[PDB]
Amino acid sequence: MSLLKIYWRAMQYLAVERTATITMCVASVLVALVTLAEPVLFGRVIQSISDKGDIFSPLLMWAALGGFNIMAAVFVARGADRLAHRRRLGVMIDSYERLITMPLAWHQKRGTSNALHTLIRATDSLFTLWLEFMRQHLTTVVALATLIPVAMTMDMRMSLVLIVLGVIYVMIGQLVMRKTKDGQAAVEKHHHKLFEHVSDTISNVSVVQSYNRIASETQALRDYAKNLENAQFPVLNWWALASGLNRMASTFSMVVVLVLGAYFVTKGQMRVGDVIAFIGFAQLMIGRLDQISAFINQTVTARAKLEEFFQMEDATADRQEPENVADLNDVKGDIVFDNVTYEFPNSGQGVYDVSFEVKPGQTVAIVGPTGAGKTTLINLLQRVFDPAAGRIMIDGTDTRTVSRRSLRHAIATVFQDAGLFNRSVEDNIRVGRANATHEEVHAAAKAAAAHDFILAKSEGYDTFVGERGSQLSGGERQRLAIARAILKDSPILVLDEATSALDVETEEKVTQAVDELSHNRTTFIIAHRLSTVRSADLVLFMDKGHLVESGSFNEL
Amino acid sequence: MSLLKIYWRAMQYLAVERTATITMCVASVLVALVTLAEPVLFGRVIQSISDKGDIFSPLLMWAALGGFNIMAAVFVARGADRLAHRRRLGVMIDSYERLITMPLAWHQKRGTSNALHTLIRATDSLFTLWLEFMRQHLTTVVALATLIPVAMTMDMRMSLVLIVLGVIYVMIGQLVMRKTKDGQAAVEKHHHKLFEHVSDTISNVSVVQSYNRIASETQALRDYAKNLENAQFPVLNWWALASGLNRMASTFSMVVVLVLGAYFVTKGQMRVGDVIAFIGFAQLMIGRLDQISAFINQTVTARAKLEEFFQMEDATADRQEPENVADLNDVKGDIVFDNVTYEFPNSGQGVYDVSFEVKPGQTVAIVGPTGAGKTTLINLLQRVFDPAAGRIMIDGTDTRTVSRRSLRHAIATVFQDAGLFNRSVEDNIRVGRANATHEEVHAAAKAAAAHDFILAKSEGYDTFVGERGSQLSGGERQRLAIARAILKDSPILVLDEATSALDVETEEKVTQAVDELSHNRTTFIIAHRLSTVRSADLVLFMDKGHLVESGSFNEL
Numbered sequence A, B: 001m002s003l004l005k006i007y008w009r010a011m012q013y014l015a016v017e018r019t020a021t022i023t024m025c026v027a028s029v030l031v032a033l034v035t036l037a038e039p040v041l042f043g044r045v046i047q048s049i050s051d052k053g054d055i056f057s058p059l060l061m062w063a064a065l066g067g068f069n070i071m072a073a074v075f076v077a078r079g080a081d082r083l084a085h086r087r088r089l090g091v092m093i094d095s096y097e098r099l100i101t102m103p104l105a106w107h108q109k110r111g112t113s114n115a116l117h118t119l120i121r122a123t124d125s126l127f128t129l130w131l132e133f134m135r136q137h138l139t140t141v142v143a144l145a146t147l148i149p150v151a152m153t154m155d156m157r158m159s160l161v162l163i164v165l166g167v168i169y170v171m172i173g174q175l176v177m178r179k180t181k182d183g184q185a186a187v188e189k190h191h192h193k194l195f196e197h198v199s200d201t202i203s204n205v206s207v208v209q210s211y212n213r214i215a216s217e218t219q220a221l222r223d224y225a226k227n228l229e230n231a232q233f234p235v236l237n238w239w240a241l242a243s244g245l246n247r248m249a250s251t252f253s254m255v256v257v258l259v260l261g262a263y264f265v266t267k268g269q270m271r272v273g274d275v276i277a278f279i280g281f282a283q284l285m286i287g288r289l290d291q292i293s294a295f296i297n298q299t300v301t302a303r304a305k306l307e308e309f310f311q312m313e314d315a316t317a318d319r320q321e322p323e324n325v326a327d328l329n330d331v332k333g334d335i336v337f338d339n340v341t342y343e344f345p346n347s348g349q350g351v352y353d354v355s356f357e358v359k360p361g362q363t364v365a366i367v368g369p370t371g372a373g374k375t376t377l378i379n380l381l382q383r384v385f386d387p388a389a390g391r392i393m394i395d396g397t398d399t400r401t402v403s404r405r406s407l408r409h410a411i412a413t414v415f416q417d418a419g420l421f422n423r424s425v426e427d428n429i430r431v432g433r434a435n436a437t438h439e440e441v442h443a444a445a446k447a448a449a450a451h452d453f454i455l456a457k458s459e460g461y462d463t464f465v466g467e468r469g470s471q472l473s474g475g476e477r478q479r480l481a482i483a484r485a486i487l488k489d490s491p492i493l494v495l496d497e498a499t500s501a502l503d504v505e506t507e508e509k510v511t512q513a514v515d516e517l518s519h520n521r522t523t524f525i526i527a528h529r530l531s532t533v534r535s536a537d538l539v540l541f542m543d544k545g546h547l548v549e550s551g552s553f554n555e556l
């Protein structure tokens, strides 16, 4: 049973706030004892024969106990509520950090939309788990644990009945658990299929709309829903049977305790009222012993998502060394490849047996057939994945002996797909040099021909853009990416298709500025348009992961 | 109070399944009456003086009533559980349909990731609302409604006390409601800000990682979380105060009922036991009257998301006319523009005063400066938004008098950003002609040079691709999009930057096949590379939403 594992992990995640956790535990123990003490007082006061309640009597003890009860209820309802939200925010922040720090392959293979779903439906489940646990469960657990001795002290037969009730509850839970586990695995798989289909279609609404396949897609979703609820029903059937069994056990226990109280007619003590006290005990227990069962149901679902949330956390194998790592500094520019080879997981293709050198001050232009291993070479330079066999040598330092923070600080890149945030243009250019100035932002925009179109439209620089920069067409996105890269001003520069959506005039106007600014550094340009590489100092072309010439600018 | 509105809307959404809803209501009424009848039996049987329970006695009535109670509990726990999931799936399917059918501007301005979040957190809230409502609330509402007459019949003073309890609960709920509403609006706004930031960053992990700003982004998220929980606390404070007040009212009502039962010592009837019966009443009520209050808390949050889910549903203003619309058929190809103008909402730019004509059998190539209103013209042709002033004329038919299904069936397009589904390549090509054959799929792949690279890699055609086609670089995505468009074979063809990521050789090899296949139809090509428009029959260029020449292929 992973219930113990996930509960202990939730406790470990909750143990950071000691100062409040111990207080919550103490208050829970106190309120459990109050809820245990109330029924005994009720049995003592329910005599109603010659009690004379309105003068002192156990009714004053009632008043004091109820006042303490309401005060403790207020304290718990405030403290647990205030703790749960703060701790959920903390867990979300730490998990978001660990999620961002993960490499790109893990994101591409799984994430984009599934990762955020995992985050949200794990943190919300953990929050509800913490809140319900604290209040109801941390009352009831210690409440029953302290109750069973008191039940043993007077009228041990009733304590035996209560023990039988507890054993029956445990047995029925365990019996239901196997079938529910078997069903819930398939249920979770089917739900994942349904959600991934929904996300895939919604994220690509333009294509599904522009091809008249809305009806087909909704029919596919209906089929997925039918598949999901086809295997869903047995789980609900078994849970309902469990509810029936525990309710029947509760009814039988009530019958037993009433009959035993009646049979004690021979032992005519004051228990004429105290029996009612025991009744409350059972009542109390039964009510609480129901609240856990449905609770268990919740976690039997939650497990699924929680498991992923832990499989991510245990996957914190990223370690750039605490201090043994030597952050590379004072970059001059010297790129050397040593027999670099890469095989994609469960696939072919990838660069094979490449070795070339780059001297400082000169630019390198990779051309050739499409899909021939250019983007993979470029992102091998930035080390988004470690080459399987071979070395990448930077100015007398191996790349695998360099901190990630230092390596990517000296490499400024424009990707093939210019990614953008939906913030303002000012912020989208500020993600270069962090806090240089506004004048340099203006200059960088001017250099990449980004100032001309933006100085006279839509509230100036403080202009919002839509998701993935959907409000600036395609070419303007390329201009903003180029301006950002130029503003970062790193010794190593990369431009993967910098002129994918620019006409000839803007292409020339941008490339001349890029050359003027980058002549002091080393840059790579990946393009099929040979016009932009007229100033290239090392022109090379590679076909299907294999070099051909790797010669100078002018060669045949 | 929108509580009545949203509850009535949930009921209307639940009224489709009449055959099961009426059964659930009947069972709820029955179990409410059973829960009302039990305490009276308890008061009658708790005498324990000369009852002689083990021979007949009210204990047999206990046994029968408890058996009916457990049977009804099983029936409700099965029926409500089976109903809720099926109805949630139905609501999700219908809302997904309405979401897909909405226009592109609404998606771009808001959706991609927020729309799916709205869907999921609205449907899950509705599901939990339905389940909790049915079981607990549709028991307790009619239970109390039928209880208050019985309380009035015997010992009207206790009924008065119960009425006072109910009035106090209503008053404290209403008092808490104003402050909770004021807080929850700001809380929801802040949560939306936090989630949009998280989604924006996660969806763009490559850029945030490649610029060493993970620390800055997590600090921004921490600041957002601090802002969210800064205004969160007063809501929890007020809710805890409400819990304290209702618990105090419950305790006072218990004191009142016990004291009144004691004062009835003068009226020495059998009520010596029946008073205990009333106690259970109060007990019952109090417990149930607590379950609603926290329930209300839930919906006070849920409202926010639910409101959006209704604002979407009420926004079903899309109507292509049921039958008055005339689906355009037998397309020959004749595109005419009539003074078409467009102003973007709260922005400048857009095509101004355009009018041109297209004859069948000839192709039209739009060139010119970047960001000059080309993509907007093309998507005006497909009518993703209605021109503000002007007409689009297709073969003697106005476009606004044409069904959307018929119009986009005759126009096959490759977008500037070639969108792809993460299904196999076979499925990504099957979204053209729906069920033509496999041989024509192979031929279409061969024509667009997509067969050569794929015949010998990664399990053939049945090759999965990642999210947004991340597993095929960029150029292969363009080839797949071109192959899809060619396979659809529509009389009107559009190619927005069909050679954005192809070298010269593949560009020629693809454009010759495209020309050979499309010479029988009319096509538009939007490109800054003049090589692909060597066969263009109508070359025109437009600058900042204004035409210049609109001449033939050869002009100066």
Ligand SMILES: Nc1ncnc2c1ncn2[C@@H]1O[C@H](COP(=O)(O)OP(=O)(O)O)[C@@H](O)[C@H]1O
Pocket (backbone or CB within 6 Å): A344, A347, A349, A350, A369, A370, A371, A372, A373, A374, A375, A376, A377, B470, B471, B472, B473, B474, B475
């Ligand atoms: N995540 C991946 N999984 C499998 N194959 C991949 C993946 N990424 C790239 N490839 C393969 O690597 C080849 C080259 O990719 P890439 O370098 O991105 O394109 P280009 O060669 O045009 O720069 C492609 O043919 C593609 O099939």
Ligand SMILES: Nc1ncnc2c1ncn2[C@@H]1O[C@H](COP(=O)(O)OP(=O)(O)O)[C@@H](O)[C@H]1O
Pocket (backbone or CB within 6 Å): A470, A471, A472, A473, A474, A475, B344, B347, B349, B350, B369, B370, B371, B372, B373, B374, B375, B376, B377
């Ligand atoms: N959703 C939008 N909101 C505001 N402005 C837009 C939007 N979409 C496009 N524009 C403006 O319209 C102009 C032309 O856009 P578009 O036609 O997509 O590019 P192109 O002219 O290169 O085809 C751009 O300069 C852009 O500023």
Ligand code: VO4
Pocket (backbone or CB within 6 Å): A473, A474, A475, A476, A501, A502, B369, B370, B371, B372, B374, B375, B416, B497
């Ligand atoms: O629609 V473009 O920005 O490729 O001219």
Ligand code: VO4
Pocket (backbone or CB within 6 Å): A369, A370, A371, A372, A374, A375, A416, A497, B473, B474, B475, B476, B501, B502
């Ligand atoms: O598919 V490419 O990386 O040659 O633009």
